[PDB]
Specification:
The structure is cut from a larger assembly and holds two copies of chain A. A three-stranded antiparallel β-sheet of chain A has the order 2-3-4. The first copy, chain A, is flat. Chain A has three domains: 112 residues, no CATH class; 130 residues, no CATH class; 117 residues, no CATH class. Chain A is mainly α. Chain A contains 19 helices and five strands. The interface between A and B is large, with 72 and 68 residues. The complex binds 1-palmitoyl-2-oleoyl-sn-glycero-3-phosphocholine (2 copies), ligand 6OU (9 copies) and N-benzylthioformamide (9BE). One ligand 6OU binds next to helix 12 and helix 13 of chain A. Chain B: It is found in: Cell membrane. Chain B: Belongs to the transient receptor (TC 1.A.4) family. Chain B: This is Transient receptor potential cation channel subfamily A member 1. Chain B: Homotetramer. Interacts with TMEM100. Interacts with EGLN1. Interacts with the scorpion wasabi receptor toxin at the same site that electrophiles but in a non-covalent manner.
């Protein structure tokens, strides 16, 4: 495709082609009612090609030029103002409403559980009428509505997850967000069920704890779609996967030190069991060694069996785990964060264009014809609509030697070709030249 | 233009609060309000006084690195809010019978204090377990190991990696930024002074004696000691020379074709 070939091969001509799409009104009247017009005729195919996979029978994607510019890493073209206004129009068309609906359903699930936790003392069995101790009134109207909201949100989450099962067709097995949602909705069901079926308070609060943990832990995954927080979520992902790869070294090293301290320091209560000794060394990992309480004061009271071996184990633990292993994790984290911030400005716009090109494949085509626009008119003097809340929302959440030497090499190759032709002409001159009075 | 400016806000807080700390010479004020204002004022005076070190040449680089790290820490705050609220409400449900986790707000403040690594394992987890005072002990220890992995290991190393990257980015351009701040200071200050003072104070030439020290050797010298102190262009020149070379070679090729066009061929034809 010639536009995609221009993006692949000569992007500095695609820049000029996009410069013809930008229009202006008057250079002197730039403050008084001034406008600029953006035309998006070269950035996408017509809509009747894109969603017509059976009947047009040609491969198409929505946002053709943007996907071609992302696959070829042409970031100076993604930062062109025509492309910026194209994504901004595409977000104001259907991306904002779809994302706020997707966030609003989950937040409707999220808020009543936190209200219900911070308004009820844990450990006590509570029911639609109140809290069983006698019954506690004066909050039952709030408690009943919050339990109904959590119950309805959990069953609609089941229906949405079953729809994603019967649509995704077994690609959803190795996916973390599905597993987190299964845990959230099952556990939030069990926390609320005493309005139907009586449950002991121990099981009820044991489920409430897990649910209130995983709701807010899952709610970090919805910050990845925004432009400010997605880079923190992807750096946290990279550091956490790097920490997962290194876990067997933790297991072996920690099990060595834990069983050694279990044999050495057996008479003390933190090292009574082997499992408690393992958990204690895991807590000592950061540097909370407890030298005076566990090593010195038993030594001065003659309560250490094997004291020399115990202090040698202490200095060996202090050298290996809090010095060496923690600095290893710090060096790995510094390297990974530098690697991620090397490619941040491309990754942001790539996530946005992937979000829109994934969302557009599911919407119906009449809605696409209704909502899209071919041109946008921008007034720099006039602010955008919805100045009260939407402006604060957009402030808070939204925002070369190689090619030179390659051109050098092309010019030098043209130079040596011309010089070869010229050398052939000079040999032809000497072949046809007339030599009189210079022979012999 | 002064609305989105931090130094104006700090000065409003400083001067209002220092007024209220002193007003018992005019109007009698209870001692509680007076010392409540004195605390805020003595905090913000010395906290504001860092902003005046930015004009000097030695300390301005530390003030701008501290600015960069602090803005980077401000951008990441919603991750702190969500993660800390998750762990705080989880510990509030789990460890409810203990005094640091009696309220949800106290539980949130306690997890914020546990952030750095002051976990209090023996006092809050072990010794209640040995006295059978933990409800849900397995879930409690699982929450403990999950908290130890997420917040002091992962999140703190993330902040360290971001700080290392930002400080490297700032020290990449330090020597230009120092002189740029000095020349911006002088070119901003000169627009407000009157013109007769400018004609009075400026000089066209300066004479420097390397053998003779500058005037005010006692205090001003110690003050000036304490507070004051390429491949791309080469390949571009390469490209210009090569372009001139190919232009000359084209002219020469045209001359050689003209030679063959006008040449006289006798006894070499056919
Ligand atoms: C003695 C003991 C020693 C042990 C040492 C062990 C050391 C080992 C340590 C850690 C290994 C375990 C880490 C688990 C998840 C890592 C993978 C992951 O999320 O990356 C990716 C996202 O990453 C993110 O950005 C998400 C980050 C937040 C998720 C938090 C949930 C975890 C809660 C669990 C707590 C359970 C505790 C319960 C207790 C009650 C997801 O993977 P992906 O498919 O690439 O991306 C798809 C993303 N979309 C498209 C779906 C959006
Ligand atoms: C559970 C809780 C969890 C919460 C997590 C929260 C995590 C979030 C953390 C932090 C976010 C808040 C940071 C506030 C300021 C950051 C912006 C800033 O100063 O940068 C710039 C300078 O930067 C500097 O170099 C100045 C540095 C010193 C200023 C210190 C004053 C702060 C005192 C507040 C303490 C209040 C406490 C009161 C209590 C009594 C100023 O901005 P600028 O316009 O670019 O430059 C103009 C500079 N000139 C020209 C004016 C000179
Ligand atoms: C997010 C938006 C939700 C905000 C609505 C919360 C109002 C509930 C509230 O204040 O109840 C009061 C308690 O407030 C809370 O602590 C609710 C905490 C939920 C915060 C989650 C966000 C009850 O006090 P009283 O009966 O007036 O005496
Ligand atoms: C307790 C532990 C529960 C945590 C399990 C969740 C881990 C899932 C991450 C995973 O498998 O990612 C894969 C990484 O695999 C690993 O190295 C995980 C190692 C864990 C082994 C511990 C036994 C591939 O990453 P990606 O899909 O490119 O992103
Ligand atoms: C390197 C990986 C090897 C780690 C596996 C060690 C687990 C052995 C273990 O704890 O065995 C028994 C199992 O204890 C438990 O409750 C679960 C143990 C799982 C620990 C695995 C964590 C390693 C990382 C402990 O028995 P006891 O407390 O001495 O009382 C017995 C009364 N009849
Ligand atoms: C890579 C090198 C690893 C070396 C492995 C050996 C263990 C590491 C120990 C280092 C300690 C450094 C200096 C300590 C010198 C103290 C001398 C002394 O009199 O203490 C004595 C030192 O105790 C010991 O550590 C002796 C070890 C006995 C184990 C016997 C068999 C192990 C030898 C391995 C043979 C392999 C040789 C291959 C080469 C006993 O004092 P106590 O423990 O206070 O008992 C009194 C009970 N109330
Ligand atoms: C390696 C360099 C080792 C340097 C010095 C080790 C000298 C210790 C051996 C004998 C000390 C006897 C003893 O009970 O020491 C007591 C305990 O001190 C110790 O045993 C310290 C042992 C430190 C061993 C360090 C070697 C481990 C190095 C591994 C690093 C691998 C990474 C206290 O001494 P005191 O208060 O003077 O008591 C006098 C009353 N009799
Ligand atoms: C308690 C909190 C009070 C702290 C408020 C002071 C923050 C002002 C910094 C600011 O707005 O800078 C702007 C940065 O905006 C942010 O990301 C601040 C995020 C804080 C959100 C918390 C709610 C632009 O920086 P600059 O003007 O280029 O230098
Ligand atoms: C993620 C962001 C959500 C954070 C909002 C949670 C605040 C809920 C809260 O503390 O509600 C009530 C408000 O408590 C306060 O004094 C201020 C709470 C503000 C906390 C916000 C900090 C989050 C970061 C606590 O009620 P109580 O102590 O149980 O006693 C009630 C007696 N009638
Ligand atoms: C990403 C993976 C997250 C998994 C989420 C589940 C919670 C994480 C827990 C991990 C623990 C690892 C090994 C522990 C095994 C111990 C077995 C055992 O006998 O303990 C038992 C373990 O307790 C539990 O944690 C059971 C949890 C009950 C909640 C029931 C409903 C939640 C299940 C979710 C279903 C979703 C499935 C989707 C796939 C009870 O002992 P206790 O708490 O000491 O109570 C005695 C009171 N005096
Ligand atoms: C993941 C690998 C998990 C490894 C081992 C878990 C084995 C614990 C289950 C059953 C232990 C029963 C128990 O009460 O343990 C007691 C408490 O220990 C625990 O429950 C430790 C639980 C650790 C769970 C770790 C899994 C969380 C991983 C999430 C990381 C995500 C990042 C003490 O044991 P004991 O002194 O041997 O008592 C014996 C007298 N009956
Ligand atoms: C191939 S013909 N390029 C795609 C395209 C995009 C916009 C307008 C025309 C063509």
């Amino acid at each position: 495709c010639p536009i995609t070939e221009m993006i692949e091969y000569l992007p500095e001509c695609m820049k000029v082609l996009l410069d013809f799409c930008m229009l202006h009104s008057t250079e002197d009247k730039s403050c008084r009612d001034y406008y600029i017009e953006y035309n998006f005729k070269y950035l996408q195919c017509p809509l009747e090609f894109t969603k017509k996979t059976p009947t047009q029978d040609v491969i198409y994607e929505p946002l053709t030029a943007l996907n071609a510019m992302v696959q070829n890493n042409r970031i100076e073209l993604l930062n062109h103002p025509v492309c910026k206004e194209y994504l901004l129009m595409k977000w104001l068309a259907y991306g904002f409403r779809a994302h706020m609906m997707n966030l609003g359903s989950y937040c409707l699930g999220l808020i009543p559980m936190t209200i219900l936790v911070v308004n009820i003392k844990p450990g006590m069995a509570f029911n639609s009428t109140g809290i069983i101790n006698i019954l506690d009134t004066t909050n039952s109207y709030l408690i009943k509505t919050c339990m109904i909201l959590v119950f309805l949100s959990s069953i609609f989450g089941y229906c949405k997850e079953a729809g994603q099962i019967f649509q995704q067709k077994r690609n959803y097995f190795m996916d973390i967000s599905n597993v987190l949602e299964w845990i959230i909705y099952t556990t939030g069901i069990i926390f609320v069920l005493p309005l139907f079926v009586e449950i002991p308070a121990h099981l009820q609060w044991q489920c409430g704890a897990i649910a209130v943990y995983f709701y807010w832990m899952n709610f970090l995954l919805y910050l990845q779609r925004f432009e400010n927080c997605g880079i923190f979520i992807v750096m946290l992902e990279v550091i956490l996967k790097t920490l997962l790869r290194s876990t067997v070294v933790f297991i072996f090293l920690l099990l060595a030190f834990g069983l050694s301290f279990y044999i050495l320091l057996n008479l003390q209560d933190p090292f009574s069991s082997p499992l408690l000794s393992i958990i204690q060394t895991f807590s000592m990992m950061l540097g909370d060694i407890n030298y005076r309480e566990s090593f010195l004061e038993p030594y001065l009271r003659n309560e250490l069996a094997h004291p020399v071996l115990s202090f040698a184990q202490l200095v060996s633990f202090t050298i290996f785990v809090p010095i060496v292993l923690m600095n290893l994790l710090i060096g790995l984290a510094v390297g990974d964060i530098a690697e991620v911030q090397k490619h941040a400005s491309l990754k942001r716009i790539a996530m946005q264009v992937e979000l829109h090109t994934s969302l557009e494949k599911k919407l119906p085509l009449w809605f696409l014809r209704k909502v899209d626009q071919k041109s946008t008119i921008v007034y720099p003097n006039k602010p955008r609509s919805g100045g009260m809340l939407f402006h604060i929302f957009c402030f808070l959440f939204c925002t070369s030697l190689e090619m030179e030497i390659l051109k050098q090499k092309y010019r030098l190759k043209d130079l040596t070709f011309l010089l070869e032709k010229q050398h052939e002409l000079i040999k032809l001159i000497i072949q046809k030249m007339e030599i009189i009075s210079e022979t012999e």
